[PDB]
């Protein structure tokens, strides 16, 4: 079911020769289809095999890794691309695993705020410590969770953006969702932020619960 | 100027039954294979059935077989795929799709088939055993002193649509609405944040709408430093 795609969140900018790969499901040289997802739209077809042949998008099969190099990028393009395969077997149709291209820019760092749970909550029955890494680029962002210095696994959620349209980066939504018992048991509460763009692991925090 | 329009999807508990419908347009359906296509919330895509709706042919992916039947109507033009005894994993959002042809094709050359040439634009089928909840709003109130940043959190609805704007509509640079994640609970939870200048806390007020159709609820907190 999974074909591996060998490229998977890679970036670039326009004007730029990318190439994206994709492993094979049987032996046999069989078709190939590539689409084009934009958020949130219907995917759309590109290329097929055999005879593959605007100018930019091109198809290529090298032995059991086809390949899908696009040589004249332009910003209409910039999104998710699926391989897909029609196997000869189970009359069964199986996909890539999906590559996303988004826009290359320069290192931005993100801004870190730290928010406690508003009482207006706890009184409810429970704490939800939030965390945000605000507008960066690289996309690739560690945030571990310390409760009393001890960093807890297992109950952080995370939610990212897509791209926004005048920066094109990102924002993170670290969400501890803590019982109200289990928060008022500990005092100092951090966030710490590891990323790409600053050169030490930057940490938000404060001090309440007991 | 052909187009294919899916039908079918929404709301239903795990265990129920929910069948989809796709009717086609401008071409000739019967000399064109018809497959449902599915993807999970920012998940990939993954096939589900395909049929050949001249000779009757069905063909199933082996993570729904048992489940799911997909069937067509040659007189109506329209496609089903009846989904029963439906799993809590099979949320997606379901697409309808065409290839080319050829009964030679279908038995001896099916690899060297086709792409997918139209696509329609899609039905959302979600599963859960959760009544539909209006979302309780939290502030987020920043404490600190340049330019700060504040927000509202959004948790324990279901079903998915809500929107949130803030001072109805006013404020839109800087408005950083996260995408919704479904807790443990079942039920969805989302928080919105917004920059600001540090002179704006005493001076401006803050307030963010949160709407949420499903439960004809509209919910208003002020966010405030504390």
């Known amino acids: 079911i999974q074909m591996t795609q060998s490229p998977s969140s890679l970036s670039a900018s326009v004007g730029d020769r990318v190439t994206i790969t994709c492993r094979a499901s049987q032996s046999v040289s069989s078709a190939v289809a590539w689409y084009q997802q934009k958020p949130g739209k219907a995917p759309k077809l590109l290329i097929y095999?055999?005879?593959d042949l605007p100018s930019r998008f091109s198809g290529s099969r090298s032995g059991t890794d086809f390949t899908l190099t696009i040589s004249s990028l332009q910003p209409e393009d910039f999104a998710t691309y699926y391989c897909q395969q029609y196997v000869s077997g189970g009359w069964l149709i199986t996909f890539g695993q999906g590559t996303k291209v988004e826009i290359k820019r320069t290192v931005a760092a993100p801004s870190v705020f730290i928010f406690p749970p508003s009482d207006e909550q706890l009184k409810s029955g429970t704490a939800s410590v939030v965390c945000l890494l605000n507008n960066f680029y690289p996309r690739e962002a560690k945030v571990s969770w310390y409760v009393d210095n001890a960093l807890q696994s297992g109950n952080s959620q995370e939610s990212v953006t897509e791209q926004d349209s005048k920066d094109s980066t990102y924002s993170l939504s670290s969400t501890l969702t803590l019982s109200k018992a289990d928060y008022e048991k500990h005092k100092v509460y951090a966030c710490e932020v590891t990323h790409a763009g600053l050169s030490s692991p930057v940490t938000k925090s404060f001090n309440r619960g007991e | 100027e052909v187009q294919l329009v899916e039908s079918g999807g929404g709301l239903v508990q795990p265990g129920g039954s929910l069948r989809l419908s796709c009717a086609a347009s401008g071409f000739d359906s019967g000399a064109y294979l018809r497959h449902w296509v599915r993807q999970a919330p920012g998940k990939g895509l993954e096939w589900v059935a395909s049929?050949?709706?001249?000779?009757?042919?069905?063909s199933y992916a082996d993570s729904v077989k048992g489940r799911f039947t997909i069937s067509a109507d040659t007189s109506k033009n329209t496609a089903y795929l009846q989904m029963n005894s439906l799993r809590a994993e099979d949320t997606a959002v379901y697409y309808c799709?065409?290839?080319?042809?050829?009964?030679?094709?279908?038995?001896?050359?099916?690899?060297?088939?086709?792409?997918?040439?139209?696509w329609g634009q899609g039905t959302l089928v979600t599963v859960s055993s959760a009544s539909t909840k209006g979302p309780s709003v939290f502030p987020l109130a920043p404490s600190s002193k340049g330019t700060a940043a504040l927000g509202c959190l959004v948790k324990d609805y279901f079903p998915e649509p809500v929107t949130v704007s803030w001072n109805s509509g006013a404020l839109t640079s800087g408005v950083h609405t996260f995408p919704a994640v479904l807790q443990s609970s079942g039920l969805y939870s989302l928080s919105s944040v917004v920059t600001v200048p540090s002179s704006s806390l005493g001076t401006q007020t803050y307030i963010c709408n949160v709407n949420h159709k499903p439960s004809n609820t509209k919910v208003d907190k002020k966010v405030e430093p504390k």
């Open positions: 049929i050949y709706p001249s000779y009757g042919y069905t």
């Open positions: 799709a065409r290839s080319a042809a050829s009964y030679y094709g279908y038995w001896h050359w099916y690899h060297f088939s086709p792409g997918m040439d139209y």
């Open positions: 095999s055999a005879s």
